[PDB]
């Protein structure tokens, strides 16, 4: 049994390129629509304050390095002298402590310079991921990064794509109960078939994830399927139909649809050709409807001789002539 | 809640639903079992009407109609009331069609009413207070006597 | 209503004719009960809710046609009598059987049966009125009573001829035979006067 | 008397895993829909700035530790000398105060280092509780934690569950009254029965908490029962009608 | 070309995008055939006294 569920194509990886530092967009490096590699420079925000911050941090680092150089010279001069006791052991230990403290301060200043350098590098906005970039949400001269992380551009990965389709909760629960109770074996391994609306474009994919939380508003559970898109035909956001298998029946019984009767209580029954060419009434529970045949769940066994004609002209136990 | 809300809840929730039947014309050359959909839309008894949802939340809490209104089966109209000898009664005025006998029509009505009175509830009884045919019967039976005498 | 019953929205002005645009769900999307479940409706928050989220289809049996006669629920039962058997006896048998029905079930006749009923009712006193009027005319003309009774003895012979002929060929007592009989009676009476006035 | 009450299945513990820090999601280390253990890595946020802050804190710690070593050596040298008055008691007291100050500075630098380390660990997005993780709200390369704690994932504990159903308030007061004068006996000890619409499975559960406040829009108090969910049959957010004993 | 939903940018959803539009019968309840082929017919009734 296959279910066609409403679904939308979503790219596997989306990177919303947002400006982290406030400034005026000086230059836009990328052209819209092209494919971009990781680290490709996209925007150039003016590094007026960040360059100054890096210069300040570098000045602090330079001072720390000067102090370290002085302490190193002190220790180098004291080391041969302390062995001949030309300087007190206290003085040598003080010099060593000063050297280690200067090394620590240089490491701290290097960390501060690294912080400033990363902050400055936040101004050369780069593509975080590889994929197809879209329109430039801002143009040169626009003030970005003040107040909020301004959206600059969007990058999407076009291969493979996701298809986040959705299923009613009750259908899922019925399927699970049938699987547990044993009427239908699960069809997880069967591949989802994708069909794009208005086109003959068909694609195959696999189901990845079945959400456990039913949507409160729509009473549905979400499922995610990954579909190969080597030609780029499958577009993000497109509405699509996914044929998800709803379990496999090894011994499915299908009969002509006209060969099912229903009683006043709603219980379905079927006329059967018993021994001695006598018509027997075997009650039946009917499943789904496929083409011109009903799926029968119980009440039938392989080899049963069902009558698919003259149902209006047959009473139980009457004698009939098979054809 | 305002009275417009309760009126509109009544209007949209107590409505018959012309659902239809699947497999209807124009039908596929494959499917062969059209059948009616028979959705239940209108409400039959006061219990069903008191279950009209006025406002329901996502959590599950609901405001049913009965929570704000008393629902019962009553008169469409309370302008007029009738009594017959101090006891609450009902009555109807039967009128004769043009060009028809009265005596025969009155006898037919009385016989029909007495036949129906066999199925009446025991607490209720029927009676015909006014009959314009009695006057004609006595008049004709006297005039016949005057002609003979 | 719109998806499965089709809904008439407004008027299509088709080159001078006002016809109605109809909206209905697609042939492939209304062929199965599952298609009813696959329909979606909008909630207050703007999402679409599938029907299967809150509706469950249960089968039952119902009337595809409800027949009512004079305002009560009815069944219309029709048939034809066995060959060579009168319809009046068939109505007799039918009312006999219907008497065996549980109390509360009424049986009524309609159209052809009602007409046959009133006809069979009226025929007898029609004959009677005819005979008394011809008697009275005959006493008027003959200035006597005996001569009227004399001539009136004629009609059973014409009736006998008509009845034997129709029975020999086996035709029923239809209106056509009845009028043939009445005109035969008329000509036999003419014959009888044409003898008796000269007598 | 059983009253069937609408309600929804709500998970025992919900972990909306959020970004505590600003940065670009470098990697996604989990598969959606899998059951994760507490402390498992889910997302890896770019640890560029936080590593630098940790390096600065460690540098300050190294400086404080060097000063501490110097002070310890000074006190060790001065310890025997003051015993024979080679150094003034005042000088030794100053040395000991310097040592205590150095130890205190070492404690402060260690505290700063630990703050920086935990800040860095906030960039290793770990699952706070064990449960089922859903779809990743953000993808690799997405900028999270800028301005607001960006939602990354949702982790739900599937066993047991709470069914939050609703009773009309006036009904609750009427039952409480009937209990009060003694026409009926309280049925608090009777288990709840939950039936999911359209299926045949029945689950028993115990009433946990009956609310005191009244829903303003509908006049109905909320209730909570707990139902064992061993097979995963009950999902979070399902509409469930709970049969509650009314005395 | 009936617009179902149109955005400020210019994108529109026309009726044909969701439905198949054609000229058809108002009602498909009754069908008539004349010797194995689809036909139509009308009953002409005589006015009184003619």
mmCIF file of C-alpha atoms in Angstrom, chain C residues 34-171:
data_model
loop_
_atom_site.group_PDB
_atom_site.id
_atom_site.type_symbol
_atom_site.label_atom_id
_atom_site.label_comp_id
_atom_site.label_asym_id
_atom_site.label_seq_id
_atom_site.Cartn_x
_atom_site.Cartn_y
_atom_site.Cartn_z
ATOM 1 C CA UNK C 34 -9.493 7.214 0.996
ATOM 2 C CA UNK C 35 -9.844 10.264 -1.234
ATOM 3 C CA UNK C 36 -12.354 11.641 1.268
ATOM 4 C CA UNK C 37 -9.704 11.348 3.954
ATOM 5 C CA UNK C 38 -7.055 12.939 1.748
ATOM 6 C CA UNK C 39 -8.985 16.207 1.536
ATOM 7 C CA UNK C 40 -7.662 19.066 3.657
ATOM 8 C CA UNK C 41 -9.447 21.937 5.372
ATOM 9 C CA UNK C 42 -7.960 25.116 6.875
ATOM 10 C CA UNK C 43 -7.714 25.757 10.584
ATOM 11 C CA UNK C 44 -7.782 29.165 12.224
ATOM 12 C CA UNK C 45 -3.976 29.461 12.199
ATOM 13 C CA UNK C 46 -3.666 29.162 8.413
ATOM 14 C CA UNK C 47 -2.389 25.599 8.073
ATOM 15 C CA UNK C 48 -4.316 22.901 6.226
ATOM 16 C CA UNK C 49 -5.731 19.998 8.242
ATOM 17 C CA UNK C 50 -6.318 16.680 6.445
ATOM 18 C CA UNK C 51 -9.760 15.167 6.823
ATOM 19 C CA UNK C 52 -8.261 11.920 8.121
ATOM 20 C CA UNK C 53 -6.962 13.826 11.147
ATOM 21 C CA UNK C 54 -10.455 14.091 12.614
ATOM 22 C CA UNK C 55 -12.845 11.976 10.499
ATOM 23 C CA UNK C 56 -13.281 8.206 10.403
ATOM 24 C CA UNK C 57 -15.295 6.444 7.721
ATOM 25 C CA UNK C 58 -17.699 3.766 8.910
ATOM 26 C CA UNK C 59 -19.846 1.829 6.469
ATOM 27 C CA UNK C 60 -23.592 1.398 6.826
ATOM 28 C CA UNK C 61 -26.649 0.796 4.649
ATOM 29 C CA UNK C 62 -29.104 3.457 3.595
ATOM 30 C CA UNK C 63 -31.799 4.465 1.122
ATOM 31 C CA UNK C 64 -30.662 5.530 -2.320
ATOM 32 C CA UNK C 65 -34.327 6.340 -2.976
ATOM 33 C CA UNK C 66 -36.972 7.375 -0.456
ATOM 34 C CA UNK C 67 -40.549 7.113 -1.707
ATOM 35 C CA UNK C 68 -43.410 8.896 0.037
ATOM 36 C CA UNK C 69 -47.110 8.745 -0.818
ATOM 37 C CA UNK C 70 -49.590 11.287 0.555
ATOM 38 C CA UNK C 71 -46.865 12.408 2.924
ATOM 39 C CA UNK C 72 -46.019 9.194 4.542
ATOM 40 C CA UNK C 73 -43.029 6.970 3.868
ATOM 41 C CA UNK C 74 -43.933 4.345 1.322
ATOM 42 C CA UNK C 75 -42.797 1.465 -0.825
ATOM 43 C CA UNK C 76 -44.101 1.343 -4.388
ATOM 44 C CA UNK C 77 -44.839 -2.290 -5.263
ATOM 45 C CA UNK C 78 -45.955 -3.029 -8.808
ATOM 46 C CA UNK C 79 -46.585 -6.072 -10.952
ATOM 47 C CA UNK C 80 -48.907 -7.785 -13.389
ATOM 48 C CA UNK C 81 -51.394 -10.566 -12.751
ATOM 49 C CA UNK C 82 -51.040 -14.086 -14.079
ATOM 50 C CA UNK C 83 -52.199 -14.486 -17.698
ATOM 51 C CA UNK C 84 -55.893 -15.199 -18.092
ATOM 52 C CA UNK C 85 -56.656 -13.802 -14.621
ATOM 53 C CA UNK C 86 -58.697 -10.694 -13.863
ATOM 54 C CA UNK C 87 -57.177 -7.621 -12.249
ATOM 55 C CA UNK C 88 -60.021 -7.197 -9.770
ATOM 56 C CA UNK C 89 -59.278 -10.564 -8.196
ATOM 57 C CA UNK C 90 -55.633 -9.490 -8.016
ATOM 58 C CA UNK C 91 -56.572 -6.374 -6.046
ATOM 59 C CA UNK C 92 -58.687 -8.638 -3.844
ATOM 60 C CA UNK C 93 -55.687 -10.899 -3.218
ATOM 61 C CA UNK C 94 -53.392 -7.926 -2.589
ATOM 62 C CA UNK C 95 -55.715 -6.337 -0.036
ATOM 63 C CA UNK C 96 -56.127 -9.744 1.597
ATOM 64 C CA UNK C 97 -52.361 -10.115 1.965
ATOM 65 C CA UNK C 98 -51.939 -6.510 3.105
ATOM 66 C CA UNK C 99 -54.453 -7.199 5.867
ATOM 67 C CA UNK C 100 -51.888 -9.687 7.223
ATOM 68 C CA UNK C 101 -49.308 -6.908 7.529
ATOM 69 C CA UNK C 102 -48.353 -5.619 10.977
ATOM 70 C CA UNK C 103 -50.688 -2.903 12.191
ATOM 71 C CA UNK C 104 -49.539 0.567 11.147
ATOM 72 C CA UNK C 105 -48.715 -0.271 7.521
ATOM 73 C CA UNK C 106 -51.237 1.138 5.050
ATOM 74 C CA UNK C 107 -51.768 0.104 1.454
ATOM 75 C CA UNK C 108 -53.029 2.464 -1.206
ATOM 76 C CA UNK C 109 -53.836 2.210 -4.890
ATOM 77 C CA UNK C 110 -52.543 4.700 -7.421
ATOM 78 C CA UNK C 111 -53.240 5.652 -11.000
ATOM 79 C CA UNK C 112 -54.397 2.658 -12.994
ATOM 80 C CA UNK C 113 -55.698 0.719 -9.988
ATOM 81 C CA UNK C 114 -57.589 3.732 -8.638
ATOM 82 C CA UNK C 115 -59.177 4.287 -12.052
ATOM 83 C CA UNK C 116 -60.135 0.592 -12.364
ATOM 84 C CA UNK C 117 -61.669 0.812 -8.867
ATOM 85 C CA UNK C 118 -63.911 3.772 -9.662
ATOM 86 C CA UNK C 119 -64.895 2.263 -13.025
ATOM 87 C CA UNK C 120 -65.954 -1.047 -11.495
ATOM 88 C CA UNK C 121 -67.864 0.970 -8.916
ATOM 89 C CA UNK C 122 -69.810 3.052 -11.429
ATOM 90 C CA UNK C 123 -70.698 0.447 -14.074
ATOM 91 C CA UNK C 124 -73.608 -1.145 -12.199
ATOM 92 C CA UNK C 125 -75.779 1.867 -11.464
ATOM 93 C CA UNK C 126 -74.869 3.185 -14.907
ATOM 94 C CA UNK C 127 -76.584 0.111 -16.373
ATOM 95 C CA UNK C 128 -79.466 0.546 -13.934
ATOM 96 C CA UNK C 129 -80.066 4.190 -14.840
ATOM 97 C CA UNK C 130 -79.955 3.310 -18.529
ATOM 98 C CA UNK C 131 -82.576 0.580 -18.110
ATOM 99 C CA UNK C 132 -84.954 2.683 -16.030
ATOM 100 C CA UNK C 133 -84.739 5.608 -18.455
ATOM 101 C CA UNK C 134 -85.427 3.432 -21.491
ATOM 102 C CA UNK C 135 -88.409 1.947 -19.645
ATOM 103 C CA UNK C 136 -89.775 5.404 -18.915
ATOM 104 C CA UNK C 137 -89.312 6.575 -22.502
ATOM 105 C CA UNK C 138 -91.046 3.439 -23.729
ATOM 106 C CA UNK C 139 -94.072 3.937 -21.483
ATOM 107 C CA UNK C 140 -94.186 7.544 -22.669
ATOM 108 C CA UNK C 141 -94.203 6.571 -26.326
ATOM 109 C CA UNK C 142 -96.493 3.527 -26.101
ATOM 110 C CA UNK C 143 -99.065 5.132 -23.771
ATOM 111 C CA UNK C 144 -98.937 1.909 -21.764
ATOM 112 C CA UNK C 145 -96.820 -0.241 -19.473
ATOM 113 C CA UNK C 146 -97.255 -3.746 -20.861
ATOM 114 C CA UNK C 147 -95.840 -2.777 -24.265
ATOM 115 C CA UNK C 148 -92.755 -1.210 -22.606
ATOM 116 C CA UNK C 149 -92.042 -4.400 -20.562
ATOM 117 C CA UNK C 150 -92.691 -6.364 -23.815
ATOM 118 C CA UNK C 151 -90.069 -4.495 -25.823
ATOM 119 C CA UNK C 152 -87.565 -4.300 -22.951
ATOM 120 C CA UNK C 153 -87.408 -8.084 -22.906
ATOM 121 C CA UNK C 154 -85.211 -7.761 -26.008
ATOM 122 C CA UNK C 155 -81.844 -6.671 -24.580
ATOM 123 C CA UNK C 156 -80.723 -9.949 -22.938
ATOM 124 C CA UNK C 157 -80.534 -11.518 -26.398
ATOM 125 C CA UNK C 158 -78.088 -8.872 -27.630
ATOM 126 C CA UNK C 159 -76.121 -9.152 -24.405
ATOM 127 C CA UNK C 160 -76.049 -12.928 -24.860
ATOM 128 C CA UNK C 161 -74.695 -12.580 -28.378
ATOM 129 C CA UNK C 162 -71.967 -10.154 -27.351
ATOM 130 C CA UNK C 163 -70.957 -12.255 -24.349
ATOM 131 C CA UNK C 164 -70.805 -15.531 -26.263
ATOM 132 C CA UNK C 165 -68.785 -13.931 -29.063
ATOM 133 C CA UNK C 166 -66.261 -12.314 -26.740
ATOM 134 C CA UNK C 167 -65.928 -15.497 -24.676
ATOM 135 C CA UNK C 168 -65.406 -17.568 -27.817
ATOM 136 C CA UNK C 169 -62.571 -15.281 -28.871
ATOM 137 C CA UNK C 170 -61.577 -14.818 -25.227
ATOM 138 C CA UNK C 171 -61.299 -11.046 -25.025
#
